[PDB]
RNA sequence: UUGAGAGAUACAAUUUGGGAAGAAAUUCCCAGAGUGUGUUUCUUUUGCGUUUAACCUGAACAGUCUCAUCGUGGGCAUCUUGCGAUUC
């Protein structure tokens, strides 16, 4: 129950403090003992929640970024009934680099809510995006395999898509959350909204997250913890640390 | 019921029990082997009489 | 032509090493193993143990069936982890050699057809509608 | 009697441990048969962690 | 480094070394027949290949009562190249002897060269089909091995059964289905063959297919029982 | 969705035979065997509909000249990134 009292302390101090109202998320920061192996790129790997949802694709504004020609992409995703109301805007990379420059990029950041791009263009994406999006780790775009078809060696790649599959993929990544792999010991992960759900949801959230990150299997995503997790601190971006689970 | 006792007629009549990897069948009786010409070939005689009474000639 | 020679030489090398391997090796047999008897009651009463008078594992082994009276590994160094490792190593080496041989003969055949593609005649290119490229010569006896 | 069968059993243990194998002999069965007879890319390895292992419930369901 | 293990039958040893192997105590050491290797432990020991020897396919196929022993006399119908028959001379050792027969003349010369070297083999170089020409020189064999591809195996083996078989004796035939009939199924052809021998007084006991060595060969082990 | 038969089974219960502990009743190693449904594989039968089907063959690539091979240069790194193989 000490965890829950500390969460009560955090949320009530969030109510009183003028700065703490103006940032509206909760981050769990973990310190373990050992440094982690994989170098820090910027592919946010996802983490599942089992009992509690977090956000809705029918609740956030979405940007999609394509391959080059984007014609069948835009028209099919617009016209075929599973994604007709989903994405705010679809645009290709070349069209983006032509269209937005500097202050226009900052206006994009101010306006749009969550960004997803094709896997085959994520590697180049942050260079046209710059580092205003790449301040820290909130608005990191994800990557989505569009066609449910795989390119073998020495064979021409087939173009297709399906709104079915892309809608399921967005509903997964918007239901549950994502973390970033590092090299140093300390790490951070966004968990939950202060009003969208409550303290039991947050505790169950933390339990499932630490369980999925402790589990030995599912290794490309969930085997991130090496050594023992020392402690978990709950904090906002502008609040302070509250210590739980110290051993 | 009586269907399964028809199959147990097959059971009392059959001559091959497998014991896992191994198998035992026994030697047919001398008087049978000596005082009967052996049985006919079902597949071959069926083939020849099928060739006779095929549908390609409108017999009957 | 010298390339076809070199690849052929290495292919024969691998073939002979595979044959010497198969000669020095030892497999295990599993075929139809029937046993006759004269009574159907004695047949239904047959038991492999009560016929061979051996143990469980001696019955279940077929490449070696010594009776208990004839039964009437310490020098072998760690048979639990080492000797099975070496048996598996020999058999995996032979499998590797066979696979290598198949690869080599494939490359040799492609190179041989290409080498024959250079001499004489009247050639004709077809595409086998699976997607193969091949040739066919005109009906033309050389002098 | 039990002693006779004991000497026998010792011999059986010797023979068994010399000869037998479990899954190693199965691997040997694989090798012997062949001797006597998942979403990744080829060029992009960041995808196979970066993807989302989507749920058939999150597909078929309409929220 | 290598250890031995004796077999159910005499003369037969399984060598447990760097690989398990089927081996027999040599008669004379340091002398090859078909380019095989050796192993010693001092005692000298000669391999068989279950491929190139059909009885080698039998032993590691597993046969309960093979009627070979050291001090006996065996008949071998079909000793081409002399390999398995020189090996059978090995397993009967010094005291026993084998009478091999053969008809084609290239393995004839090969077997007679092995007869020049090894004593316990006595060769007869005839067509098998008229046993008078070797009942002048053979008397009262104990056991019989028959690997002849001719389809009248029953006739030729019944002939040598009436002529030379020891009473209550042991006989082993090999059967190639794809040589006798070459269209139909293995156990079918086998049952027909052992029917032939049963009518020809040979009481069979077991048969066994040699699967991972041969293409649908089997061997039939039986006895000669109260017969002349 | 006409019959018959053969085999692999998965599970559910059933059961032979050797070793081993058992004062004993009972239990554990093994090699098994039969029954229930289910998963079939194959053989075969029955009816109905149908008379061709498939592959080859001769003077069957080629003036918008074709094809083989070695080389030169260019795109495709938002990827057919190309195997002694044929990226275009």
Q: Could you provide a short overview of the structure?
A:
Chain D: This is Regulator of rDNA transcription protein 14. The structure is cut from a larger assembly and holds chains A (247 residues), B (60 residues), C (143 residues), D (63 residues) and E (228 residues). Chain D has 63 residues and is mainly alpha-helical.
Total beta strands of chain A: 10
| Rg calculated over all Cα atoms of chain A | 20 Å
- Continuous helix count of chain E: 7
Question: In terms of quaternary structure, what is this?
Answer: part of a larger assembly
Strand-and-helix sequence of chain E, N→C? Answer: EEEEHEHEHEHEHEHHEE
The main sheet of chain E orders its strands as: 7-6-5-8-9-11-10
SS content category of chain E: alpha/beta
Question: What share of the residues of chain A lie within helices?
Answer: 25-40%
Structural description of this entry:
- This is part of a larger assembly, with chains A (247 residues), B (60 residues), C (143 residues), D (63 residues) and E (228 residues).
- Chain A is an alpha/beta fold and 247 residues long.
- Chain A has two domains: 1-55 and 177-246, no CATH class; 56-176, no CATH class.
- Chain A has helices at 2-16, 18-21, 71-79, 93-99, 103-111, 119-122, 125-129, 163-175, 199-214; strands at 27-32, 45-47, 62-65, 89-91, 114-118, 142-144, 177-179, 187-190, 229-235, 242-244.
- In chain C, helix 1 (2-24) runs antiparallel to helix 6 (79-116).
- The longest helix of chain C is centred in the last third of the chain and has 38 residues, at 79-116.
- Chain D is built from four helices and no strands.
- Chain C binds chain E through residues 22-36, 51-52, 62-67, 70, 75-76, 86-87, 90, and chain E through 3, 5-8, 14, 16, 18-22, 36-37, 49-51, 57, 60-62, 64, 186-187, 204-213, 218.
- The structure holds one RNA strand of 88 nucleotides.
Features:
part of a larger assembly, 5 chains, B: 60 residues, two-stranded antiparallel sheet, C: 143 residues, 6 helices, RNA-binding, U3 small nucleolar RNA-associated protein 16 (chain B), Ribosomal_uL1-like (chain A)
SSE diagram, text form:
The structure is cut from a larger assembly and holds chains A (247 residues), B (60 residues), C (143 residues), D (63 residues) and E (228 residues).
Chain B (H helix, E strand, L loop, with lengths): L1 H12 L3 E3 L2 E3 L5 H5 L7 H11 L8
Antiparallel strand pairs in B: 1-2
Chain C lengths: L1 H23 L8 E3 L4 H6 L3 H4 L3 H5 L7 H4 L7 H38 L6 E6 L3 E6 L6
Antiparallel strand pairs in C: 2-3
Chain E lengths: L11 E4 L5 E5 L12 E3 L3 E4 L6 H6 L13 E5 L5 H10 L4 E5 L3 H13 L3 E4 L7 H4 L7 E4 L6 H12 L4 E8 H4 L5 H14 L2 E8 L7 E8 L4
Parallel strand pairs in E: 5-6, 5-8, 6-7, 8-9
Antiparallel strand pairs in E: 1-2, 2-4, 3-4, 9-11, 10-11
The structure holds one RNA strand of 88 nucleotides.
